[PDB]
Design a protein around this ligand. Structure first.
Ligand SMILES: Nc1nc2c(ncn2[C@@H]2O[C@H](COP(=O)(O)OP(=O)(O)OP(=O)(O)O)[C@@H](O)[C@H]2O)c(=O)[nH]1
Ligand SMILES: NCCc1ccc(O)c(O)c1
Lengths: 128, 341, 235, 276, 57
């Protein structure tokens, strides 16, 4: 059974820092392009950033450009979203989604309600 | 914790680990150790004996008849053609309303054909109409998603699978869903009825397969192990096993009584997904329709790849073995069903 | 029993001649798939085509431009996991991707979906017609100056209006820079893959535009021209 | 002799190459039904059959007469010259047709996909072959072409059958391919506009290479022979040996036609799976 | 959220009290069904051209 466990994330003041570790179990980590999808309270799912099969090509949403980074380690079979300088609007649950097909560059994993290969979330709250 | 969601999440994981332990407890040996002393099938080189042309678009589903002679084929040009596979003659050419058909079945009595697709409707057509032309007879409505597969039990009960993540057993006459099967999270893509009509399995895009009891409307077993979307499924002829093919370029054989995966069929030169799976009459050979336009015939006991059917020039979308096992047909997106033996 | 062989042979003859007429009709119909996020106007585009040009929230519309038939269909009654029924559309002439350019936060969803469509293994050869819809609302937001693009896409701050831009008479340079920025945001993905098997044709559209059939005609014709060129290795 | 054996082996190699290329195309067509599906393939098959006929009918007898030095077949050769005029004219004709074919599928894709039905394809192939048969045989059996076995042509028949068989197809082919070039230049400019917008003459070289290869192989192979058929009977100036090598160049083009008109990817793969 | 979780948990409780057999016996049944039907599988045991409906006349 494919399952993804995220960890990290707690109450952090604005401008702080955090590091969300997403550990994957049940498949071959290297083959799948990985993304970080955050959901802020009261709004639909939003997609934050993606990293390719081996960290070759990375891409970010505009709002988190220059603030967050995303690293993939196939050795320990995980990926990390290191967030710094968090704003009051970065308050959201942080699913670490994987696209459903290997050896490709496309995926459709921001689905409205149910996608089967993303985790459960660590509600990161940031306020003064 | 106190929050009933976190207590249900904890007891959920506890149950999932009790299931993994009760599954590894009966996983004493492996199929390879047991089947290491059999002789390999060698090389199986079937050849195109027929080529069935006429379809104007990509074929998406096909189904042998019970007589192992006739077959129905559904193409996405909005047509559903019935073939006499011995003589390559067309017996009927049924035009469809919605042109996006995705599945088609052949009733075991030969009296009806069914089909459905993005219209979310399963349409039954009476081939034995008397005065006039074969036309629509029944039409089963109710799904909020695209209908992906359907197979008759008898002339009145038919099971459908849909993209609304549910399967349903219908009474064709009344047109009512006599039974609903829910529990899948993703799109149900394929179903296969057991040789005794009693149960059926379904493979969904949540990388899971589920065994359903037809008459009771309850989910009996849920199998996992695949890394991605399950695209095809077919019971082992005995009825106590079934095979699945998925987008992760692997075939897996599951057993019902052991409640776990038994064998994985893969090669490191095979990366593309899998579109169709089917056993031979004796279940020794497993045919799979990969995306790389070929169909690989695996030895279902040794996990070795044995033969290839490289006769299609595009993706093999469907396949099917006759009920007497005399030949297998393959439909592809090049619009040419081909008979092999 | 020879009677039954002759009956099968003449059944095949009547079938094959019906299938030949059906082949010619299906061969001459240009199927067009309408795709795009919701709240973007896909169904409104189909509604407009049925009332202006003609047709059949219903999924399909059939219309003729210069004696050439088209069938444009938007799928409405599905879920949001379009990852599997999308492969039911591999032979369409073109995909008309409509994007609400005035929805600054669901716009990244449109960019990701366009990127995922462009790199799909089964739609690698399906050319896409890009409709940047709701230009009047976009001009409203740009002239209002309350929600600026830079807050969502900071690249827009250093972005320069292309030297080939052709604004219509009476248009604020801020609106021109905004709509050509969205245009190039989708073109950098459509052209980043390459290979010449398919292309992206952007068009700025609004809900009241009536010529939105001549544009689809022109661009289906351009798609067929380029397919025929790349077949003979000319282009 | 050294020169004689070299000419013999070179001519035998040329004949064998023609036979191999054209029979390979014809076999890849008859065996594989997915190549016969389109219509442009119908026209390419017509061309291939014309060229295979050129080889099997016309070349070996002329090669034998060139080696031995004397025409050892006598009354045959009446027929032979007729055969030549037919086969070497169904080839040029077919090129013209194929060119026109391409034009309709790039200058008017909708009209093309609608109107060019196998009935029109068969009518066009028939027109080419029947123009060939008429202009060749009919003046031979009526002995209008004449003003070792003689193969010279009367001054008026030479220019007339030459004007048709070469100068109408070469005019049509140059007009057609220059229009196709204009169209490709338009599309290149448009794609370049889009790509420069995105980033903010390789495709031109590719266009030039393919059009130049097609038109230039055809011209550099046939044009000398036909300017000779023009100049020679009037000024009967050059000698038989020079005229003969310039004749052989035409059938050399008839040899080269497969690689230039049947190397689409599917054609390549059909050849590869046929021969091995 | 809570209804799909009650259904997922009740599904796991129904599935937990199933009785499973050893894989060794399941494989012995697959091998038995294979060799028990080996003589009737034309794709495994090739059929004489006399009894092939797709090559005959
Ligand atoms: N003012 C203005 N409104 C527009 C324009 N384009 C679309 N709309 C509005 O946007 C609404 C959403 O479009 P719909 O017709 O619902 O199509 P869709 O939302 O993209 O897809 P569906 O939800 O399946 O219908 C329409 O009802 C229009 O009123 C536009 O260019 N100008
Ligand atoms: N060996 C080619 C000789 C030839 C071919 C065609 C003609 O029309 C002609 O006048 C002469």
């Amino acid at each position: 059974q494919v399952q993804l466990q995220e960890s990290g994330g707690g109450l952090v003041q604005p401008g702080g820092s955090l590091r969300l570790s997403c550990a994957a179990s049940g498949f071959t980590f290297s083959n799948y392009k990985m993304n970080w999808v955050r959901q802020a309270p009261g709004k639909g799912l939003e997609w934050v950033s993606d990293i390719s099969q081996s960290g070759a090509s990375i891409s970010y949403t505009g709002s988190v450009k220059g603030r967050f980074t995303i690293s993939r380690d196939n050795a320990k079979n995980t990926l990390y979203l290191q967030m710094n300088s968090l704003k009051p609007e970065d308050t959201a649950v942080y699913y670490c989604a994987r696209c459903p097909a290997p050896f490709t560059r496309d995926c459709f994993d921001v689905t409205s309600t149910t996608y089967a290969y993303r985790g459960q979330g660590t509600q990161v709250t940031v306020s003064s | 914790s106190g929050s009933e969601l976190d207590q249900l999440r904890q007891e959920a994981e506890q149950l999932k680990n009790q299931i993994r332990d009760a599954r590894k407890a009966c996983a004493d040996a492996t199929l390879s150790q047991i089947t290491n002393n059999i002789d390999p099938v060698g090389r199986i080189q079937m050849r195109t004996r027929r080529t069935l042309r006429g379809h104007l678009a990509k074929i998406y589903a096909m189904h042998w008849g019970t007589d192992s002679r006739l077959l129905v084929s559904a193409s996405q040009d909005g047509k559903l053609i019935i073939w006499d596979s011995y003589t390559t003659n067309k017996v009927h050419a049924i035009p469809l309303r919605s042109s996006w058909v995705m599945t088609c079945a052949y009733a075991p009595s030969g009296n009806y054909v069914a089909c459905g697709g993005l219209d979310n409707i399963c349409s039954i057509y009476n081939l034995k109409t008397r005065e006039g032309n074969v036309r629509v007879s029944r039409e089963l409505a109710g799904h909020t998603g695209y209908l992906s597969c359907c197979r008759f039990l008898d002339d009145n009960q038919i099971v459908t699978s849909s993209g609304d993540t549910t399967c349903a057993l219908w009474d064709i006459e009344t047109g009512q869903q006599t039974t609903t099967f829910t529990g899948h999270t993703g799109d149900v893509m394929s179903l296969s009825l057991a040789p005794d009509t009693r149960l059926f399995v379904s493979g969904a895009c949540d990388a899971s397969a589920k065994l359903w009891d037809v008459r009771e409307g309850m989910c009996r077993q849920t199998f996992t192990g695949h890394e991605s979307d399950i695209n095809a499924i077919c019971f082992f002829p005995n009825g106590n096993a079934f095979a699945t093919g998925s987008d992760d370029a692997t075939c897996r054989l599951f057993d019902l009584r052991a409640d776990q995966e038994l064998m994985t069929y893969s090669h490191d030169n095979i990366i593309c997904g899998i579109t169709s799976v089917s056993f031979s009459k004796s279940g020794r050979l497993l045919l799979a329709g990969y995306d790389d336009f070929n169909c690989n015939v695996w030895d279902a006991l040794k996990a070795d790849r044995a033969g290839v059917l490289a006769g299609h020039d595009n993706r093999v979308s469907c396949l099917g073995v006759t009920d007497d096992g005399m030949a297998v047909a393959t439909g592809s997106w090049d619009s040419f069903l081909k008979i092999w033996n | 029993q020879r009677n039954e062989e002759k009956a099968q042979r003449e059944a095949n003859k009547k079938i094959e001649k019906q299938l030949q007429k059906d082949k010619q009709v299906y061969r001459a119909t240009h199927r067009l798939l309408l795709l795009g996020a919701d709240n973007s106007g896909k169904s409104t585009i189909v509604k407009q085509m049925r009332i202006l040009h003609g047709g059949s929230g219903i999924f399909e519309t059939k219309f003729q431009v210069d004696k050439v038939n088209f069938h444009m269909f938007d799928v409405g009654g599905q879920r949001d996991e379009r990852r599997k029924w999308i492969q039911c559309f591999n032979d369409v002439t073109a995909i008309i991707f409509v994007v609400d350019s005035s929805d600054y936060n669901r716009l990244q969803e449109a960019l990701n979906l366009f990127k995922s469509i462009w790199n799909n293994r089964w739609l690698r050869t399906i050319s896409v017609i890009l409709f940047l819809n709701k230009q009047d609302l976009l001009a409203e937001k740009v002239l209002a100056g309350k929600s600026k693009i830079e807050d969502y896409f900071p690249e827009f701050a250093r972005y320069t209006t292309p030297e080939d831009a052709t604004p219509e008479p009476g248009e604020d340079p801020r609106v021109t820079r905004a709509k050509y920025f969205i245009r190039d945001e989708f073109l950098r993905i459509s052209t980043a893959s390459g290979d010449g098997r398919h292309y992206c044709y952007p068009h700025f559209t609004c809900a009241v535009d009536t010529e939105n059939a001549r544009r689809i005609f022109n661009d289906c014709r351009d798609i067929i021209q380029r397919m025929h060129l790349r077949q003979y290795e000319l282009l | 002799f050294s020169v004689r054996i070299l000419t013999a082996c070179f001519l035998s190699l040329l004949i064998l190459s023609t036979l191999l290329g054209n029979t390979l195309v014809c076999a890849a067509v008859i065996r594989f039904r997915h190549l016969r599906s389109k219509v442009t393939n119908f026209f390419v098959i017509s061309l291939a059959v014309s060229d295979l006929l050129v080889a099997v009918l016309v070349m070996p007898w002329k090669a034998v007469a060139e080696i031995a030095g004397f025409w050892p077949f006598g009354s045959f050769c009446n027929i032979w010259v007729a055969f030549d005029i037919m086969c070497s004219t169904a080839s040029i004709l077919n090129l013209c047709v194929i060119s026109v074919d391409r034009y309709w599928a790039i200058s008017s894709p909708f009209r093309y996909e609608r109107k060019m039905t196998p009935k029109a394809a068969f009518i066009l192939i028939s027109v080419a072959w029947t123009l060939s048969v008429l202009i060749s045989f009919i003046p031979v059996q009526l002995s209008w072409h004449k003003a070792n076995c003689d193969s010279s042509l009367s001054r008026t028949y030479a220019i007339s059958s030459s004007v048709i068989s070469f100068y109408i197809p070469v005019a049509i082919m140059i007009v057609t391919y220059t229009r196709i070039y204009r169209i490709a230049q338009k599309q290149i400019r448009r794609i370049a506009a889009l790509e420069r917008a995105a980033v903010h003459f390789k495709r031109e070289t590719k266009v030039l290479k393919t059009l130049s290869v097609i038109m230039g192989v055809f011209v550099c192979c046939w044009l000398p022979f036909f300017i000779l058929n023009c100049i020679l009977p009037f000024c009967g100036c050059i000698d038989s040996n020079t005229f003969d090598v310039f004749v052989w160049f035409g059938w050399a083009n008839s040899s080269l036609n497969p690689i230039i008109y049947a190397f689409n990817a599917d054609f390549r793969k059909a050849f590869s799976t046929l021969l091995g | 959220s809570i209804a799909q979780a009650r259904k997922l948990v009740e599904q796991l409780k129904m599935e937990a009290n199933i009785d499973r057999i050893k894989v060794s016996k399941a494989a012995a049944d697959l091998m038995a069904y294979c060799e028990a039907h080996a003589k009737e599988d034309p794709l495994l045991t090739p059929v004489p051209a006399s009894e092939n409906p797709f090559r005959e006349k």
